[PDB]
Write a protein that binds this ligand. Structure first.
Ligand SMILES: [Ca+2]
Ligand SMILES: [Ca+2]
Ligand SMILES: [Ca+2]
Ligand code: NA
Length: 484
C-alpha cells in the first residue's frame, strides 16, 4: 500500500559511544511516522578496529557486541542485546531492518602463518612479480567467543591473498599459492582482476568458505530477525557466489530477504553486468545517479537537467535501483569524497522520493545533520531543507501514474495522478537555474493545487482537461498537491 522508503541509519563519523542501537529504538516511532519503512544499519559484528571500527574491518561476524574481543565487549554501535532490542522495536513500528553484510575479507587475525605466495602488481593483479614465503595474518579462532554459535576456524587456505608480509615487513599484494588457488571470477576486471581489496581476501571458491558464509547467514537471520541485507563491496566478490548465497537463504528460510549490493562505480554498464551475472537476485545502489547529482550541484545552473537521470539504474532498470543522494563513502573527508553541494540536495531528494522509479534511500547525515572532525578538518553537514516534509510527501501523496517532463535544461518536472488509497494529485517542479514555469498534465480537472513546501504561495488550478501551468523559483523545488 505505502511507498517504501529506506534510510542509511549511520555515517562514517558517528561517535564511538555505543549508542546507535539505543537511538534506533528511541526513534523508530518518529521515523515510521515520517514515512520510513526500512533502515539499513551498519555492520553489527566485531571489527579489527574494535569499538572504533565503522564495521568494514570485519573480524568475527558471530560477535554482535556480545564477547570480549578486539578491546571491548560492545561494537561501535552497542551490545548484542541492544541490537536485538532495536530490531524488535523497529518491527513493532512497522520498519524492516537490512543488515550490512561484509564478506569480502577478514581483518584482525588472532595469529599469523607462513604461506607460499606470488607477489602481484598493484595495478594489474594478473601480473606476477616473484614468489615469496610470507607470514600472513590469516588465523581466526575467536578465542573470546569460546565456540558459542560456531566452532569454525579460518586458516590460510580459506583466503586468496593478503597485502602484508609480517616477516619481511613488506606491503604488497601476495596471492596465495596452492592447488586450485586463484583470484576469484567473476569480479570487476578493473586492475586486471579486482578480487583483492584489503585485509585477508576470502576465497569464494573454497567449499568450506562457501558453506560457512551460508551457515552464518541462517544463524544471523534467526538470531536477529533482520529482514534483508546490504551487501558490502560486491565488485570485489565472486558474483556467482553472491547469487548462490542469497538464493540459498531465501530457499532455506522462505523469507523474501530483500537485498541490495554496493557496486560503487559510476559506469552504469558495470552495474548492469553485475545484475545480469547475478540473475537479478539483488538490487544495487544507483552510484551513477549520485554522480549526476554531484555534477549538477557543482555546475552553477549550467547542468543540462534533461539528462539528470541518464546513465543510471533509476532510468535503465528501476526495479533493481536503490536510489540515493549521498552516503558514507561520498561524505566529506572520505577517500571517495564527492559530496553533493548542499543547495541542490532538496532537489535531488525531491527527485528520488517523488518519482515513481526506484527505491529511495535517505542519508542519516542529510536527515539529522552531522558535525565531526578528522585530520584537523572540521566538517558541518547541515540538515537538508524540507527533508522531513519530502519524506512525508512521498508517504502520503506521491502515488499513481506518472507523466514526466525532463524537457528543459533548467526547469524539469513530473506529475503523479494518485491512486485509490491516496487519491491526491501532485506536480513536482524544480530548476537548477533561474525560475520558470511548465505546462503539465495531472489528469485532475478544474482542481486547486498548492505548494506543500510553502515556497510559492499562489494557487494553481488545472483546466477542464487536467492541464495547468506550474511555477518554480530559481535554484529551487516546489511540490504542488491537489488533495481529494
Ligand atoms: Ca579464489
Ligand atoms: Ca575479494
Ligand atoms: Ca541547467
Ligand atoms: Na577471493
Amino acid at each position: 500500500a505505502q511507498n517504501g522508503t529506506m534510510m542509511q541509519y549511520f555515517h562514517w563519523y558517528v561517535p564511538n559511544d555505543g549508542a546507535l542501537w539505543t537511538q534506533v529504538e528511541n526513534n523508530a516511532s518518529a521515523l515510521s511516522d515520517n514515512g520510513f519503512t526500512a533502515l539499513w544499519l551498519p555492520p553489527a559484528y566485531k571489527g579489527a578496529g574494535g569499538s572504533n571500527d565503522v564495521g568494514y574491518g570485519v573480524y568475527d561476524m558471530y560477535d554482535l557486541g556480545e564477547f570480549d574481543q578486539q578491546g571491548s565487549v560492545r561494537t561501535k554501535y552497542g551490545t548484542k542485546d541492544q541490537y536485538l532490542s532495536a530490531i524488535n522495536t523497529a518491527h513493532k513500528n512497522n520498519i524492516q531492518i537490512y543488515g550490512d553484510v561484509v564478506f569480502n575479507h577478514r581483518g584482525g587475525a588472532d595469529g599469523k602463518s607462513w604461506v607460499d605466495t606470488k607477489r602481484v602488481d598493484w595495478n594489474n593483479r594478473n601480473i606476477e612479480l616473484g614468489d615469496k614465503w610470507i607470514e600472513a595474518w590469516v588465523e581466526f579462532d575467536f578465542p573470546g567467543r569460546n565456540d558459542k554459535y560456531s566452532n569454525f576456524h579460518w586458516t590460510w587456505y580459506h583466503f586468496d591473498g593478503v597485502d602484508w608480509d609480517d616477516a619481511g615487513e613488506e606491503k604488497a599484494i601476495f596471492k596465495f599459492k596452492g592447488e586450485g588457488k586463484a583470484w576469484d571470477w567473476e569480479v570487476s576486471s578493473e586492475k586486471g582482476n579486482y578480487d583483492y581489496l584489503m585485509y585477508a581476501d576470502l576465497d569464494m571458491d573454497h567449499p568450506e568458505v562457501k558453506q560457512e558464509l551460508k551457515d552464518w547467514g541462517e544463524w544471523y537471520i534467526n538470531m536477529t530477525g533482520v529482514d534483508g541485507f546490504r551487501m558490502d563491496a560486491v565488485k570485489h566478490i565472486k558474483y556467482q557466489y553472491l547469487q548462490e548465497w542469497i538464493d540459498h537463504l531465501r530457499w532455506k528460510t522462505g523469507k523474501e530477504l530483500f537485498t541490495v549490493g554496493e557496486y560503487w562505480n559510476y559506469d552504469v554498464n558495470q552495474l548492469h553486468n553485475f545484475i545480469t551475472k547475478t540473475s537479478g537476485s539483488m538490487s544495487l545502489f544507483d552510484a551513477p545517479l549520485h554522480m549526476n547529482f554531484y555534477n549538477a550541484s557543482k555546475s552553477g545552473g549550467s547542468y543540462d537537467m534533461r539528462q539528470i537521470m541518464d546513465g543510471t539504474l533509476m532510468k535503465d532498470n528501476s526495479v533493481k535501483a536503490v536510489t540515493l543522494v549521498e552516503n558514507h563513502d561520498t561524505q566529506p573527508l572520505q577517500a571517495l569524497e564527492s559530496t553533493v553541494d548542499w543547495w541542490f540536495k532538496p532537489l535531488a531528494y525531491a527527485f528520488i522520493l517523488l518519482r515513481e522509479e526506484g527505491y529511495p534511500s535517505v542519508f542519516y547525515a542529510d536527515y539529522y545533520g552531522a558535525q565531526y572532525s578528522d585530520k584537523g578538518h572540521d566538517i558541518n553537514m547541515v540538515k537538508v531543507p524540507y527533508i522531513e516534509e519530502l519524506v512525508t510527501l512521498r508517504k502520503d501523496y506521491a502515488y499513481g501514474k506518472q507523466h514526466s517532463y525532463l524537457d528543459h535544461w533548467d526547469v524539469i518536472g513530473w506529475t503523479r495522478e494518485g491512486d485509490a488509497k491516496h487519491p491526491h494529485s501532485m506536480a513536482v517542479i524544480m530548476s537548477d537555474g533561474p525560475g520558470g514555469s511548465k505546462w503539465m498534465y495531472t489528469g485532475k480537472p478544474s482542481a486547486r493545487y498548492v505548494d506543500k513546501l510553502g515556497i510559492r504561495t499562489e494557487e494553481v488550478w488545472t483546466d477542464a482537461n487536467g492541464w495547468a501551468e506550474f511555477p518554480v523559483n530559481g535554484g529551487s523545488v516546489s511540490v504542488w498537491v491537489s488533495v481529494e
